[PDB]
CSV table of C-alpha atoms and ligand atoms in Angstrom, one decimal:
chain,number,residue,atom,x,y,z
A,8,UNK,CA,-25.7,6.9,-0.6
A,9,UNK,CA,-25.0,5.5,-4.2
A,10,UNK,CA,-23.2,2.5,-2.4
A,11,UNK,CA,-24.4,0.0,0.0
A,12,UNK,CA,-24.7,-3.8,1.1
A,13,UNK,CA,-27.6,-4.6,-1.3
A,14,UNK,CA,-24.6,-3.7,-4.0
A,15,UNK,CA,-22.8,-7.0,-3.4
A,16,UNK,CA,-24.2,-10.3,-3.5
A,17,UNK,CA,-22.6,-12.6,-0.8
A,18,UNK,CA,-20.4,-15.7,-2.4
A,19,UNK,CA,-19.3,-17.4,0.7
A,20,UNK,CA,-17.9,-16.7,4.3
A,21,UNK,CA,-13.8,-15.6,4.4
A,22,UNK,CA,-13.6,-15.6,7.8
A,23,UNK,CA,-15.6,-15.8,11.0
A,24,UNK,CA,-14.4,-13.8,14.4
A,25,UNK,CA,-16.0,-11.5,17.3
A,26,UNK,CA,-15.8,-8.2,15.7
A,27,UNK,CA,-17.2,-9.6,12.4
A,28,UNK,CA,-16.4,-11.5,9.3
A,29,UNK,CA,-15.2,-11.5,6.2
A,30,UNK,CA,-17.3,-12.4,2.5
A,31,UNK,CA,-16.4,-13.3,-0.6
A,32,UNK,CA,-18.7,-11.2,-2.8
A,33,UNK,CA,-19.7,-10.6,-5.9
A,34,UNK,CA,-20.9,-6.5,-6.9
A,35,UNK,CA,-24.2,-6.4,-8.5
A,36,UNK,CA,-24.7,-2.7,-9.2
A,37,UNK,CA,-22.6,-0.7,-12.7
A,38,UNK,CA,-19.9,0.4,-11.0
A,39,UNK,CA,-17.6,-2.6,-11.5
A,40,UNK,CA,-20.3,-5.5,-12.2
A,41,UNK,CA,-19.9,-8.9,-11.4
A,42,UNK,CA,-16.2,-7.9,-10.2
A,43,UNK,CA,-15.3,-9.8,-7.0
A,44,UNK,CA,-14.1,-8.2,-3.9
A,45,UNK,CA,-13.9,-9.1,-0.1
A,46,UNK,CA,-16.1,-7.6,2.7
A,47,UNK,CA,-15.3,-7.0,5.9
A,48,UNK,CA,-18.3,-6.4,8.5
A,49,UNK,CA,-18.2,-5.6,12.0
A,50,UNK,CA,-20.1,-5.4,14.9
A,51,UNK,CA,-20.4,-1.3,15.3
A,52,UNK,CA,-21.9,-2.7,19.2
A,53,UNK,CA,-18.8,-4.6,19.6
A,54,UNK,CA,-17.0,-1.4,18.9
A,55,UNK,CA,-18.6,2.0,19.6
A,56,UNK,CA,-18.9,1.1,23.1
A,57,UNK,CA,-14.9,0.3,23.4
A,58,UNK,CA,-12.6,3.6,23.2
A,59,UNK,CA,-10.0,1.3,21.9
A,60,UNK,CA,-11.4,-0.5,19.7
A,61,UNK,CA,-13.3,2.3,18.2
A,62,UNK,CA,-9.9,4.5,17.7
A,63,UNK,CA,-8.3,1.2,16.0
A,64,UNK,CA,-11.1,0.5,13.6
A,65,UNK,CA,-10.9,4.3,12.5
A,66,UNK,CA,-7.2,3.9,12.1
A,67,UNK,CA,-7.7,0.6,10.3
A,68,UNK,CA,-9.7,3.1,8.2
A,69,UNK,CA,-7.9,5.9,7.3
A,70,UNK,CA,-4.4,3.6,6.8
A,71,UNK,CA,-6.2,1.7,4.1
A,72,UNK,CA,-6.9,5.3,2.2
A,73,UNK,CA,-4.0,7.4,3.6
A,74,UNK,CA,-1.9,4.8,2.3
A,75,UNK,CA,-1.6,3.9,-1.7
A,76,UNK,CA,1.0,1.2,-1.9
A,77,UNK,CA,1.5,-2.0,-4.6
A,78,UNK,CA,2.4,-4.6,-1.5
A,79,UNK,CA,-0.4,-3.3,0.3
A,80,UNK,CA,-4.0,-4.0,-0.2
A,81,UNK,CA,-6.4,-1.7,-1.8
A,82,UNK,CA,-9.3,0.0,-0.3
A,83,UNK,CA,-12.1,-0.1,-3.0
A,84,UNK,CA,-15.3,0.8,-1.3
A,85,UNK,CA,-16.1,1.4,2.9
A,86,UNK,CA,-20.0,2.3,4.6
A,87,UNK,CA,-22.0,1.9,7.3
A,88,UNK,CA,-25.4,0.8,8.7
A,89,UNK,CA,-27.3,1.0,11.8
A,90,UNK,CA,-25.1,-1.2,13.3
A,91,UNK,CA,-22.5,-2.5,10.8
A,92,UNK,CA,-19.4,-1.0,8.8
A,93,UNK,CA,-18.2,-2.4,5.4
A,94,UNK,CA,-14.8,-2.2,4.1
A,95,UNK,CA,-14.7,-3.5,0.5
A,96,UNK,CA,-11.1,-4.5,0.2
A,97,UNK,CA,-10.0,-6.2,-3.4
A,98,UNK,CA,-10.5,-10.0,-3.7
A,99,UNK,CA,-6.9,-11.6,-3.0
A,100,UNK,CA,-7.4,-14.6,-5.3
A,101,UNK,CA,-3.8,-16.0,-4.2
A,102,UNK,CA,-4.3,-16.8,-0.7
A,103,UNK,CA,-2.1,-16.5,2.1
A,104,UNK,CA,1.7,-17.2,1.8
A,105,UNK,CA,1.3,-19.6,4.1
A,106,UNK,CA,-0.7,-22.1,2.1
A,107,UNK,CA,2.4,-21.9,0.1
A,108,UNK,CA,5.4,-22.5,2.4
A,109,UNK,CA,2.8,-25.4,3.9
A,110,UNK,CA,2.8,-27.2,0.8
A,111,UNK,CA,6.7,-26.8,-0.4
A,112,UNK,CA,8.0,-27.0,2.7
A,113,UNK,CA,10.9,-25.2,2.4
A,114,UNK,CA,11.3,-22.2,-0.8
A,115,UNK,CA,14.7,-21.9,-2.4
A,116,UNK,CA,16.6,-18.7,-1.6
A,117,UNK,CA,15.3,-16.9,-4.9
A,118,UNK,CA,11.8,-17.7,-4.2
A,119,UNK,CA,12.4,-16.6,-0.2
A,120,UNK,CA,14.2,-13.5,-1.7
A,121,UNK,CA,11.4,-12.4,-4.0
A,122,UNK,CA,9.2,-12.5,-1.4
A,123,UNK,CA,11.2,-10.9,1.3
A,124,UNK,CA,12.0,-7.7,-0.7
A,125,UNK,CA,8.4,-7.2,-1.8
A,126,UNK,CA,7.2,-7.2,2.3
A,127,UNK,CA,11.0,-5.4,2.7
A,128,UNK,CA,9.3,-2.9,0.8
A,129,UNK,CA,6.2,-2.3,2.2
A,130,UNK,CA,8.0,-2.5,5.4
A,131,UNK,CA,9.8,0.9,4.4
A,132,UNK,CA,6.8,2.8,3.0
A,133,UNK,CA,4.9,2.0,6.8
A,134,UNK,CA,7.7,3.4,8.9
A,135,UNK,CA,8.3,6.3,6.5
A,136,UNK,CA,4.5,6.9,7.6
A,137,UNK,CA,5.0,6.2,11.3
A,138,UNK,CA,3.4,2.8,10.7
A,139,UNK,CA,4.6,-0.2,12.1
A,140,UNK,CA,3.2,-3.0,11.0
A,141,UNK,CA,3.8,-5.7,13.8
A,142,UNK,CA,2.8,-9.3,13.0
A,143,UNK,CA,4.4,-10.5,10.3
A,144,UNK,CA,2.9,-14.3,10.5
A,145,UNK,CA,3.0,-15.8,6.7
A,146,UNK,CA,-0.7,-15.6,7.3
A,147,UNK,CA,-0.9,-11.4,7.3
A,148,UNK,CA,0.6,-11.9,3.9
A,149,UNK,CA,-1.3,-12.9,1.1
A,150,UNK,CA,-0.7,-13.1,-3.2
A,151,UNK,CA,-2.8,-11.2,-5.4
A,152,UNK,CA,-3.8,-13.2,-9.3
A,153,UNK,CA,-0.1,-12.6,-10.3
A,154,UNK,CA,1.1,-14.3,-7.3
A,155,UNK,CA,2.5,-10.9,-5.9
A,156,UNK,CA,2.6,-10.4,-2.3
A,157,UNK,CA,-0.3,-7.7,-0.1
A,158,UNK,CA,0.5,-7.2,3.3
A,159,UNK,CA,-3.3,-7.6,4.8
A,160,UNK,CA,-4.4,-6.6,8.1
A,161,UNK,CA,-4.5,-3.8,10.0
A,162,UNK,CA,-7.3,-4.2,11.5
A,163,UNK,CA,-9.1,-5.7,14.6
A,164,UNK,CA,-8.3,-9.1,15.7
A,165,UNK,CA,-9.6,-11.8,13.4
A,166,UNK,CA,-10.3,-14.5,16.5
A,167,UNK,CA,-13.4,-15.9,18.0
A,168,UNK,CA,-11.1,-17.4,21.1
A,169,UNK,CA,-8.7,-14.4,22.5
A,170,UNK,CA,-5.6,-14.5,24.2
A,171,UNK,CA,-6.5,-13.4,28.1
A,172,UNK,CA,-9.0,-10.4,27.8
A,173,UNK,CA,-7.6,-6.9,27.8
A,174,UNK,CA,-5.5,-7.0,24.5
A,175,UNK,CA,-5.4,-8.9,21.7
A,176,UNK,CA,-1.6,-8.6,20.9
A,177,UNK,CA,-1.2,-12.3,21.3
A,178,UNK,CA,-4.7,-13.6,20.4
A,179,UNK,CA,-2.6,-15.5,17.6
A,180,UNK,CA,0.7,-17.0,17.0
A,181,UNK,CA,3.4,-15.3,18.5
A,182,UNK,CA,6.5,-17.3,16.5
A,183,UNK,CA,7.1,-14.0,14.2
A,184,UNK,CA,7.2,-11.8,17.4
A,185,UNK,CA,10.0,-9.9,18.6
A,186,UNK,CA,11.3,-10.3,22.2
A,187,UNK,CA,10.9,-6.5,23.7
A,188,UNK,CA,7.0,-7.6,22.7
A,189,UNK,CA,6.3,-10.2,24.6
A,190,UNK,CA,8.5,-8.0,27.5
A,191,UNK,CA,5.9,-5.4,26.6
A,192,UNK,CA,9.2,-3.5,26.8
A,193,UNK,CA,8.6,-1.0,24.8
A,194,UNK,CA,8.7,-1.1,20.8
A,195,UNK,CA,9.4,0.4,17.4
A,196,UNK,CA,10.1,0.1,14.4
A,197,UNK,CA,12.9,-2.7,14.7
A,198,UNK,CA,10.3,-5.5,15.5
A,199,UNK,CA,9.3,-5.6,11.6
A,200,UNK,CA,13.2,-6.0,11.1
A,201,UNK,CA,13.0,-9.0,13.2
A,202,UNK,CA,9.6,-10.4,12.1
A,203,UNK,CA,11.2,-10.1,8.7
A,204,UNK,CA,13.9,-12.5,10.0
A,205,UNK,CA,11.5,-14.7,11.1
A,206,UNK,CA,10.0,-14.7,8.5
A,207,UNK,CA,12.8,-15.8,6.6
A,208,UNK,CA,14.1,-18.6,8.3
A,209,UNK,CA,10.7,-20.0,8.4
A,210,UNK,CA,11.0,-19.8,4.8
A,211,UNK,CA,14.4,-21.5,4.3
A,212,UNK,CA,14.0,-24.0,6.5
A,213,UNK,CA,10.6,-25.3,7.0
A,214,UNK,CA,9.7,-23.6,11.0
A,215,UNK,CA,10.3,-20.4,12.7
A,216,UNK,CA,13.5,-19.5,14.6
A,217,UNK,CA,12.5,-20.7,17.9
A,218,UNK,CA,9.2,-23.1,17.6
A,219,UNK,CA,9.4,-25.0,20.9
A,220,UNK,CA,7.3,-28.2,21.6
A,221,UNK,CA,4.5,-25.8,22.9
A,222,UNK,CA,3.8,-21.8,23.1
A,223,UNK,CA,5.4,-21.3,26.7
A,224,UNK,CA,8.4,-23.5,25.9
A,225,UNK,CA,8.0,-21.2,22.2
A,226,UNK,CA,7.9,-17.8,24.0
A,227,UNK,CA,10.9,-19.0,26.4
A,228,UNK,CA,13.1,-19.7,23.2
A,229,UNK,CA,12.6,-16.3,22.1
A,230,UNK,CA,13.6,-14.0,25.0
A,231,UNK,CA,16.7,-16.7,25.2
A,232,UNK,CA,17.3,-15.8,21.4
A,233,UNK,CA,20.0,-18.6,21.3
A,234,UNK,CA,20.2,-18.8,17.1
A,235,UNK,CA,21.2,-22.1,15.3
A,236,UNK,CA,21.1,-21.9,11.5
A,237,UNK,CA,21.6,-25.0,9.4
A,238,UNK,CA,25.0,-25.6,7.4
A,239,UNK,CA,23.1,-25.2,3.7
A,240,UNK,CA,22.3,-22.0,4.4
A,241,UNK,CA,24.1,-19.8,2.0
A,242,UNK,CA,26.4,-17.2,3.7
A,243,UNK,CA,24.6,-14.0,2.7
A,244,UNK,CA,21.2,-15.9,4.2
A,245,UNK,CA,22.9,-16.8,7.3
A,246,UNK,CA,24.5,-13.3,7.6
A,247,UNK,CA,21.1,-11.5,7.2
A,248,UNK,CA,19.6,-13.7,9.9
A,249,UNK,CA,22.0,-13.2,12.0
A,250,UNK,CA,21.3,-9.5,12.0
A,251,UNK,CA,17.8,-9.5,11.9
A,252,UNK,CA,17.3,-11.9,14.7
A,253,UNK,CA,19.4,-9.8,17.5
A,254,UNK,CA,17.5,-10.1,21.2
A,255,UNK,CA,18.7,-5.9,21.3
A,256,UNK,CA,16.8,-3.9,19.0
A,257,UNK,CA,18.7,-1.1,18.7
A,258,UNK,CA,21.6,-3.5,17.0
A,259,UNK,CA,19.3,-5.0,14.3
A,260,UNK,CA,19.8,-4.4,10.9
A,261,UNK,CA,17.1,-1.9,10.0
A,262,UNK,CA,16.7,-0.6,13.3
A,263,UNK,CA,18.8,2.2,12.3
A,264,UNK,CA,17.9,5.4,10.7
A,265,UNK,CA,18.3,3.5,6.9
A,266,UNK,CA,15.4,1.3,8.4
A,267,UNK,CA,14.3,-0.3,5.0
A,268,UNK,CA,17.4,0.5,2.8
A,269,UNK,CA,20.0,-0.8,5.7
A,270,UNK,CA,17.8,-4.4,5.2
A,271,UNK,CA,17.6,-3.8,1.6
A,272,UNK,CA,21.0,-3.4,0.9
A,273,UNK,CA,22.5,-6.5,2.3
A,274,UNK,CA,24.2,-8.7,0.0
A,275,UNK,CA,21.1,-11.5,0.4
A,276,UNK,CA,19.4,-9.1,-2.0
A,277,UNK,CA,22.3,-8.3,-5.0
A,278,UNK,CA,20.1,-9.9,-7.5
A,279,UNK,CA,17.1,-7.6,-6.4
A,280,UNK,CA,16.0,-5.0,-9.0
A,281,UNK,CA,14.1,-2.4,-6.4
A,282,UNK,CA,13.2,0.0,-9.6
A,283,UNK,CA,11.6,-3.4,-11.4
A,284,UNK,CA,10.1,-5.0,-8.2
A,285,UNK,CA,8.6,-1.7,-7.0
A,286,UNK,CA,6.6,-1.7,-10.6
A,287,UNK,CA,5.8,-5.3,-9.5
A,288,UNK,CA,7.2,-6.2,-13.7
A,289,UNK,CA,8.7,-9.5,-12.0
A,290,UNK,CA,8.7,-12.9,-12.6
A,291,UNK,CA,6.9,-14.0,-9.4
A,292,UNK,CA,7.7,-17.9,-8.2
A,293,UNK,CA,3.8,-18.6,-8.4
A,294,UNK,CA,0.5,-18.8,-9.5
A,295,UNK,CA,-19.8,6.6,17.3
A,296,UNK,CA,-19.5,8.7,15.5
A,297,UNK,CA,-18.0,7.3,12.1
A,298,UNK,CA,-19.3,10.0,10.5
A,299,UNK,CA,-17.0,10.0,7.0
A,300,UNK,CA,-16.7,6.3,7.3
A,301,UNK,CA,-18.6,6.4,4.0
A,302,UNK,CA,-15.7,6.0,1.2
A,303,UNK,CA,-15.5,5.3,-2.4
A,304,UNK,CA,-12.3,5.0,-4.6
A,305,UNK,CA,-10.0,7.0,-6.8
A,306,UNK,CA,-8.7,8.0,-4.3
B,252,5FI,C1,-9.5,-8.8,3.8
B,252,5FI,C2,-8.4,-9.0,2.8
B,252,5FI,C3,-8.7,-10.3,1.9
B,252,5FI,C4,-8.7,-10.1,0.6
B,252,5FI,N1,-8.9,-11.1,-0.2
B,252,5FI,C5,-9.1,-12.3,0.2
B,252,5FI,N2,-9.1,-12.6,1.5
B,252,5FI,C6,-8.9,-11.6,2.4
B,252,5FI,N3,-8.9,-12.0,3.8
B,252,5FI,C7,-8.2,-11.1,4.8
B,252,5FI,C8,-7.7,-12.0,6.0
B,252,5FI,N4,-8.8,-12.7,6.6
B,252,5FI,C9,-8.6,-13.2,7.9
B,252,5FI,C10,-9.7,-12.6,8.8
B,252,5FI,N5,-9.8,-11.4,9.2
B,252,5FI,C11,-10.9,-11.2,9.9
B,252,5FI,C12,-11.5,-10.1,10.5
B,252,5FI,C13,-12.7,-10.3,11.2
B,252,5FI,C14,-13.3,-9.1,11.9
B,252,5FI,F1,-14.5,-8.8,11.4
B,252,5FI,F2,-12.5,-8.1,11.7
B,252,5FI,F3,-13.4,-9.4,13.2
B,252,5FI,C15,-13.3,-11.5,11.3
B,252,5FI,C16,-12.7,-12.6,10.6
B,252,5FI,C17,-11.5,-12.5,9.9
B,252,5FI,N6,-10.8,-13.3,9.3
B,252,5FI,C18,-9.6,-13.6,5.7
B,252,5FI,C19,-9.3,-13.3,4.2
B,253,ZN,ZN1,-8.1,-11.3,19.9
């Protein structure tokens, strides 16, 4: 096919893991010349051979096509080899939105807001597509050049060093994680609702909702789910958070059948445009057998 690795000259390593890893590249070939884009490459022997796995990766695949969305990352080009695939994702020039909270610290409410309502969104298009997106760390969330917020990974984990064997649920942290998860109690929807809050209080105040002084003391203060918010919080934050962040699911805001729009509506959000933010026209704060794996774009 017209497409293939020789296509893209390789700028520098993104990320290394067992499945794979992750290039910066430059495209060589007409198409888009010299336009840079990220490759993902994994293992197909890491894979195939895992039933598991292999139905993840394929879902990784179609969600990234099935799914058009301006929060969530753009499939450009996806292949194969003898024993590779290659999703061609576009280049996210912004970085992660945690680079950003690690350098301010703490972001002021209309910078948290922003930020919240684009993910708030995305959130909503997922579950309107039985799609629940699970790990909201800030490091699943990245900024495009105009400092707009892609939600990034839906794909295998991104480790060398895994959490146990089996799963990877918890390969990474689990501060953004919702109780009935680490109960492997069941789950839906809801545990975005609370990631979100998590989220958020991360945001406002520097650390996530129940960091303890290690990740067993962490995953203790979680299933406890005894909430302290700080006094500068402004009431709408502190009433959000307090809905998010409920240990029942079925209770937190969002949980319901408005899912998104229950969230969205809160008064934390009144100076939200949804029409403008949707058209991203705002003012950001910053900056076996794999057969049709072979993809290219529009659409
Ligand atoms: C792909 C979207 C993106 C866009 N623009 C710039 N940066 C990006 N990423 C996405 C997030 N990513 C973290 C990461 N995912 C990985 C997946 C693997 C895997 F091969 F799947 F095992 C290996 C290492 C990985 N490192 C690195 C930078
Ligand atoms: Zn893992």
């Amino acid at each position: 096919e017209k497409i293939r690795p020789e296509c893209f000259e390789l700028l520098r390593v993104l990320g290394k893991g067992g499945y794979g890893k992750v290039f910066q590249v430059r495209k060589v070939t007409g198409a888009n010349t010299g336009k840079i884009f990220a490759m993902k490459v994994l293992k197909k022997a890491m894979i195939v051979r895992n039933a598991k796995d292999t139905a993840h990766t394929k879902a990784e695949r179609n969600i990234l096509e099935e799914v058009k969305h301006p929060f969530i990352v753009d499939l450009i080009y996806a292949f194969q080899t003898g024993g590779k695939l290659y999703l061609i994702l576009e280049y996210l020039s912004g970085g992660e939105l945690f680079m950003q909270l690690e350098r301010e610290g703490i972001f002021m409410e209309d910078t948290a807001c922003f930020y919240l309502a684009e993910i708030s969104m995305a959130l909503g298009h997922l579950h309107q597509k039985g799609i629940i997106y699970r790990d909201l760390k800030p490091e699943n969330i990245m900024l495009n050049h105009q400092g707009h917020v892609k939600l990034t990974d839906f794909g295998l984990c991104k480790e060398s060093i895994h959490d146990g064997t089996v799963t990877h649920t918890f390969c990474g942290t689990i501060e953004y994680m919702a109780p009935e998860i680490l109960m492997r109690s069941g789950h839906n929807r809801a545990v975005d609702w609370w990631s979100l809050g998590a989220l958020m209080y991360d945001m406002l105040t520097g650390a996530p909702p129940f960091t303890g002084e290690n990740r067993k003391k962490t995953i203790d203060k979680i299933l406890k789910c005894k909430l302290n918010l700080p006094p500068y919080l402004t009431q709408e934050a502190r009433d959000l958070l307090k809905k998010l962040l409920k240990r029942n699911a079925a209770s937190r805001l969002g949980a319901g059948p408005g899912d998104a729009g229950e969230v969205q509506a809160h008064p934390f959000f009144r100076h939200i445009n949804w029409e403008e933010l949707l058209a991203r026209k705002v003012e950001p704060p910053f900056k076996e057998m794999f057969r049709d794996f072979e993809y290219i774009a529009d659409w």
